Design a protein around this ligand. Sequence first.
Ligand SMILES: O=c1ccn([C@@H]2O[C@H](COP(=O)(O)O)[C@@H](O)[C@H]2O)c(=O)[nH]1
Ligand SMILES: O=c1ccn([C@@H]2O[C@H](COP(=O)(O)O)[C@@H](O)[C@H]2O)c(=O)[nH]1
Lengths: 256, 256
Amino acid sequence: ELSFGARAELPRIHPVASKLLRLMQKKETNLCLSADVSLARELLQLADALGPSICMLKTHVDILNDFTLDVMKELITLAKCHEFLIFEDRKFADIGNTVKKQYEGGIFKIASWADLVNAHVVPGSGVVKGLQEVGLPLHRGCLLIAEMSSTGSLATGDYTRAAVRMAEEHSEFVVGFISGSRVSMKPEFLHLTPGVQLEAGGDNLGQQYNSPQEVIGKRGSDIIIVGRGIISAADRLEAAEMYRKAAWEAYLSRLG
Amino acid sequence: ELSFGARAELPRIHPVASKLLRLMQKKETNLCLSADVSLARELLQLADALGPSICMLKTHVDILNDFTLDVMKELITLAKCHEFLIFEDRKFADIGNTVKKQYEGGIFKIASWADLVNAHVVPGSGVVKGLQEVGLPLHRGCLLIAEMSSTGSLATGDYTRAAVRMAEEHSEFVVGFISGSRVSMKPEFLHLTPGVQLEAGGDNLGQQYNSPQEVIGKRGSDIIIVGRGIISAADRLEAAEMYRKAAWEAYLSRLG
Ligand SMILES: O=c1ccn([C@@H]2O[C@H](COP(=O)(O)O)[C@@H](O)[C@H]2O)c(=O)[nH]1
Ligand SMILES: O=c1ccn([C@@H]2O[C@H](COP(=O)(O)O)[C@@H](O)[C@H]2O)c(=O)[nH]1
């Protein structure tokens, strides 16, 4: 098992994965903030204050009441200043011809500002081929959704194996997974795990939580994705630091 | 087997399904236009000219370069005038708590103007529960994606059966399916089939085509969804009429 800093140098590493792994090692953070807010001002104030604590800020641009491309420009300024990637959790899940348009165009122009996006594998590999036509020229990366945190998820068994095969066959663009665990034995791939809180529980719409120690330490994932565990706390900076320290120590203790 | 007009009166019919089935029968159309354009002016000119030929206009609001809510107001005027439903092909596919916000809020406010949306079943039934908490009060309907037209689709076997169960257990909100065939034996549910052209072929990104006669007549679906077969033709009105007549006669010949 290699450190994040050593994985950043692997021969087959994608440049976006390398950039991420280097800033994870430099800043001692494997925390991705899930910035699940409706106001641009709150998104940007969280990005600025929590930027030093995170390797990545995950967006849902389509829930931002006051989205503009200028908001995205200000978010990029903060991502460059504090050194984190921007991940739009758009979950592309259409035919290749459609997702290429949804990624490049419309009002969001996601590919212009998102380092990373993700896709469901259920439509078959055309979803990746369509995205990669926009993303490769724009030097972007993609995550494939191999496992999901929600109750009744059908992303199990052969489905998860199909996501891993699709990733390992599109390594020029696919840099890793949304998963609950290590699903690929290839260290070039990133594992990002949502459904994370320090306390046991869930929500009223099928979300299930596991702790940073469980998903990084026992399940072998790389990065925790945390929304409400931080966003709903009074002091979001201290909450981010709690999650960062939990995920970082779980990572170190797996390394030995 | 019942006519569309008789299915509109079934005891367990959803009001949105009933409205659709009545206008299908009245206008002799089971054609859904896939309005896959980037200009509001082209979307509205297609909606006006093809409105009389279609039961439904399917949007991807996120590929419109000049989306505003006032464009959607103008589309609703045309939908009311010509009598067709608006279906936003958003393919919601996240945890329940997130999709509720993606459906109601952000820039698009999809629930404010879309009669129908659709969802992938892969996250489990929380995706439907989240959507239905916005959609039920707004008297909307939802389609579940049981099968997909694209090469390598994993929406087969047990996955398709899970989509049918999830629909039949959420019948207050779920009115049918995106599918390649009849997947439910319950006549209250609508089957809408994309991947349709008159000629054999596909695209370069995994789309596969079958004819209206195949999907309506042999495979027992209700509605054809047609994009490029119409949109790329010179005379989009005549193309819409050719698809309408094909789908309508295939439906009549299965009725006897
Ligand atoms: O399997 C998945 C994939 C994405 N997500 C997303 O991650 C975030 C989880 O937020 P939470 O920590 O508040 O539950 C939220 O934005 C979801 O849309 C999951 O929760 N689970
Ligand atoms: O299984 C599915 C579901 C949706 N769609 C959508 O239907 C449309 C197909 O358009 P086309 O006729 O131009 O191939 C397009 O908007 C797709 O996003 C499929 O093609 N297949």
